[PDB]
Design a protein around this ligand. Structure first.
Ligand SMILES: [Cu+2]
Length: 100
């Protein structure tokens, strides 16, 4: 019964070491999940082997949700989460910043 753009936070499971394998995470929360579409991107390109958790929600249908994939970072490679949702007129993109 309330409306809001979905919050998106992008972080790595362990602290990042170039060349060392790790996991990339995108935590999405908001209202009215409603077929929301989430992708992870390596240099603007959609990744294939992406897992997600069950979607958690409460009465008013606020929700959170996690998408992730194993990956192994470098300085050259650009990583990001991309979300598609009714409240968005276009796909929203948050970049993974290992210092932020
Ligand atoms: Cu609502």
């Amino acid at each position: 019964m309330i409306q809001r753009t979905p919050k998106i936070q992008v972080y790595s499971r362990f602290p990042a070491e170039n060349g060392k394998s790790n996991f990339l995470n995108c935590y999405v929360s908001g209202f009215h999940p409603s077929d929301i579409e989430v992708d992870l991107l390596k240099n603007g390109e959609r990744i294939e082997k992406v897992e997600h958790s069950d979607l958690s929600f409460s009465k008013d249908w606020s929700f959170y949700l996690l998408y992730y994939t194993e990956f192994t970072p470098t300085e050259k490679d650009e990583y990001a989460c991309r979300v598609n949702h009714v409240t968005l007129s276009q796909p929203k993109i948050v970049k993974w910043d290992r210092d932020m």
